[PDB]
């Protein structure tokens, strides 16, 4: 899976990456994995090399990453303490985070247009 | 694949749906396909039932769908005549179109934040 | 996933289909699922239509399917009673069960040749 | 895709890996790719490291790999010269080659049992 959808009451999923869960895609000889680790660090790996992280290892147990409806990605511990947030917020709406073939992780939104074909 | 990326100079793909190509995902035993047909109609199917279309069948040959850098999705023929465009545009930037598990097809953008981990 | 590997001491997986798990592939807009149901019946579905089954529903609880090292597929309950087995056995070795695009589910083995590239 | 099926008149596919085509699976931080290259060498790579090859680079152009009905995998050039064969043959039947999570590439067959649910 390549995408997390912002919290919303519909069956778009995933909306949460719990500990041990990840986005992953393949490019060439590279696996890119964006994973909420059991030590509370959310990391992007290119094969076994860490390329970017929230640097929150050791802050909590049972952490999850959630994308809020204003586009902010947060990591929250199992006691419900937010230990990291992305730094820019948008208008409330619907957003997606995508792990992309170019190795960038990008949050896009809000939604500009849709077919309106839910169901 | 579930996503089209807006035309841009990087290796995100796909950026064009040529004729016969599609996005496709599964929801249970339903297959959702968003396909650029040979007859120039761009159609969302739930299994074999058409649920939405640009209604452009017969209007051109050798058609493609592209997501422009202002977030407008267009269907263009092999003589470069645009025969359909979505109706709302945003600022120039990067956008994505996603076929979602809830059966909506949505354009999001522009990019709000990224890890900046290209390449 | 399209394949079950016979029980063996290496990291090939899956080697067991626990209840609710399945093999699944797509052929066009048909979904073929070979599922170990909660009611102990192991069933091949074409979409929502059952096309073959072990006819073991209600015979046990908490059932699993495993492919033994002689190529026999068995359904075993959570009290380790075998309630169904395929009818032909081969020599001990390594075998695979595959859900194939032609909608047949086939057990092959034992291994005839390999690159010998484990690990 | 993880499997090649032996040549047979049914729509199990793939039965041929043409030049540039490959099997690929992910394990952990590893991509394993088994690819018929444009230089006629059929290679198994673990990320960018070649781990095993037929050593047929430079023997031909437009080569393809085919799994015959007696279980022998061959590489054949676009002039139809066989330039490599696996060394053990079985009875004629149906076989499969699988690129496995343990990094072994294995041909299994002949078929021992099937549901007989073709269609």
Contact C100, C106 (CB under 8 A): yes
Q: How many CB atoms are closer than 10 A to CB B5?
A: 24
The tokens of D71 are what?
């279980």
Contact A117 B12 (CB under 8 A): no
Solved using: X-ray
Q: Roughly how many angstroms between the first and final C-alpha of chain C, as a whole number?
A: 21
A103 touches chain B (CB under 8 A): yes
Which chain C positions have a beta carbon within 8 Å of D50's beta carbon?
none
Contact D108 C105 (CB under 8 A): no
Which chain D positions have a beta carbon within 8 Å of C5's beta carbon?
100
Q: Each residue of B68-80: b (16+ CB within 10 Å) or e?
A: bbbbbbbbbbeee
Q: Each residue of D67-76: b (16+ CB within 10 Å) or e?
A: bbbbbbbbbb
Q: How many CB atoms are closer than 10 A to CB B98?
A: 25
**Residue in C108, C110, C109, C100 with CA at minimum distance from that of residue C34:** C100
The secondary structure of residue D15, as a DSSP letter, is: S
Examine chains D and B and say if they touch (3+ CB pairs below 8 A).
no
Measured CA to CA, the distance from residue B49 to residue B33 in angstroms comes to 10
Measured CA to CA, the distance from residue C32 to residue C102 in angstroms comes to 10
Q: Which residue has the tokens 């040979």?
A: B38
Measured CA to CA, the distance from residue A12 to residue A9 in angstroms comes to 8
List residues bridging with D82 in a β-sheet. D76
Measured CA to CA, the distance from residue A93 to residue A114 in angstroms comes to 13
D31 touches chain A (CB under 8 A): yes
Measured CA to CA, the distance from residue D1 to residue D5 in angstroms comes to 11
Contact D57, D40 (CB under 8 A): yes
The tokens of D22 are what?
């490959």
| D6 burial level (CB within 10 Å; 0-12, 13-18, 19+) | buried
Contact D24 A24 (CB under 8 A): no
Contact B69, B93 (CB under 8 A): yes
Q: Please tell me the number of Cα atoms within 13 Å of C96 on its side-chain side.
A: 29
The secondary structure of residue B40, as a DSSP letter, is: S
Contact C26 B31 (CB under 8 A): yes
Contact A86, A73 (CB under 8 A): yes
In D1-119, at which residue ranges do the beta strands (DSSP E only) sit? 3-5, 16-17, 22-27, 30-36, 42-46, 49-53, 64-67, 73-76, 82-85, 95-99, 105-109, 111-114
Measured CA to CA, the distance from residue A31 to residue C31 in angstroms comes to 28
Three-class DSSP category at C117? coil
Question: What Å distances lie between residue B68 and B5, B16, B86, B96, CA to CA?
Answer: 9, 10, 10, 10
Contact B3, B13 (CB under 8 A): no
- Maximum distance among all Cα pairs of chain B, rounded to whole angstroms: 44
A10 touches chain D (CB under 8 A): no
The residue numbers preceding gaps of C to N over 2.5 A in chain B are none
Contact D6, D96 (CB under 8 A): yes
Measured CA to CA, the distance from residue A109 to residue A107 in angstroms comes to 7
Q: Resolution of the coordinates in A?
A: 1.7
Measured CA to CA, the distance from residue B61 to residue B44 in angstroms comes to 19
Which chain D positions have a beta carbon within 8 Å of A45's beta carbon?
29
Contact D35, D56 (CB under 8 A): no
Contact B40, B56 (CB under 8 A): yes
List residues bridging with D75 in a β-sheet. D65, D84
Three-class DSSP category at D47? coil
Measured CA to CA, the distance from residue C69 to residue C97 in angstroms comes to 12
Measured CA to CA, the distance from residue D98 to residue D14 in angstroms comes to 12
List residues bridging with A26 in a β-sheet. A31
Measured CA to CA, the distance from residue D110 to residue D91 in angstroms comes to 7
Three-class DSSP category at D52? strand
Contact D115 C104 (CB under 8 A): yes
Q: Roughly how many angstroms between the first and final C-alpha of chain A, as a whole number?
A: 21
- Maximum distance among all Cα pairs of chain D, rounded to whole angstroms: 44
**Residues recorded for chain A:** 119
Which chain C positions have a beta carbon within 8 Å of B26's beta carbon?
26, 31
C26 touches chain D (CB under 8 A): no
Which chain C positions have a beta carbon within 8 Å of D117's beta carbon?
44, 51-52, 103-105
CA D29 to chain centre: 23
Q: Which chains touch D (3 or more CB pairs under 8 A)?
A: A, C
Contact A31 D30 (CB under 8 A): yes
Three-class DSSP category at D96? strand
- The C-alpha torsion from A49 through A50 and A52 to A56, rounded to 10°, is 180
Q: Which residue has the tokens 């948008």?
A: A90
Facing residue for D47 by CB, picked from A33, A45, A47: A47
The tokens of B81 are what?
């005549």
B112 touches chain A (CB under 8 A): yes
- The C-alpha torsion from B8 through B13 and B17 to B19, rounded to 10°, is 130
Q: Which chains touch B (3 or more CB pairs under 8 A)?
A: A, C
Examine chains A and C and say if they touch (3+ CB pairs below 8 A).
no
**Residue in A23, A57, A20, A52 with CA at minimum distance from that of residue A40:** A57
Examine chains A and B and say if they touch (3+ CB pairs below 8 A).
yes
Question: What Å distances lie between residue D65 and A2, B80, C3, C78, D4, CA to CA?
Answer: 32, 40, 22, 44, 10
**Residue in D26, D18, D80, D4 with CA at minimum distance from that of residue A31:** D26
Q: What are phi and psi of D5, to 5 degrees?
A: -100, 150
CA-based angle B6:B11:B15, to the nearest 5? 30
Q: Roughly how many angstroms between the first and final C-alpha of chain B, as a whole number?
A: 21
The enclosing H or E element of C4 equals strand C3-5
D27 vs chain C: nearest CA distance in angstroms? 10
Q: Please list the alpha-helical segments (H only) found in D1-119.
A: none
Measured CA to CA, the distance from residue B17 to residue D77 in angstroms comes to 33
The tokens of A24 are what?
């992953």
Q: How many CB atoms are closer than 10 A to CB A9?
A: 6
A42-46: strand order across its sheet: A22-27, A30-36, A42-46, A49-53
CA D103 to chain centre: 14
A16-17: strand order across its sheet: A16-17, A64-67, A73-76, A82-85
**The CATH number fitting domain A1-119, selected from 1.10.10.10, 2.130.10.10, 2.90.10.10, 3.40.50.1970:** 2.90.10.10
Contact C65, C75 (CB under 8 A): yes
Those residues with Cβ within 8 angstroms of residue A9's Cβ, 6 or more apart along the chain or in another chain: none
Dihedral (CA of C23, C26, C32, C38) sign: positive
**Residues recorded for chain C:** 119
């Amino acid at each position: 899976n390549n995408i997390i959808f912002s919290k919303q009451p519909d069956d778009n999923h995933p909306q949460i990456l719990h500990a041990t869960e990840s986005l992953e895609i393949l490019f060439g000889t590279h696996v890119y994995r964006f994973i909420m680790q059991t030590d509370c660090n959310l990391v992007l790996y290119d094969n076994n090399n860490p390329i970017w992280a929230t640097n929150t290892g050791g802050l909590g147990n049972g952490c999850r990453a959630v994308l809020q409806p204003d586009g902010v990605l947060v990591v929250i511990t199992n006691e419900n303490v937010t230990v990291w947030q992305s730094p820019v917020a948008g208008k409330a709406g619907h957003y997606v985070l995508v792990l992309q073939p170019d190795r960038n992780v990008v949050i896009y939104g809000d939604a500009l247009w849709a077919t309106q074909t839910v169901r």
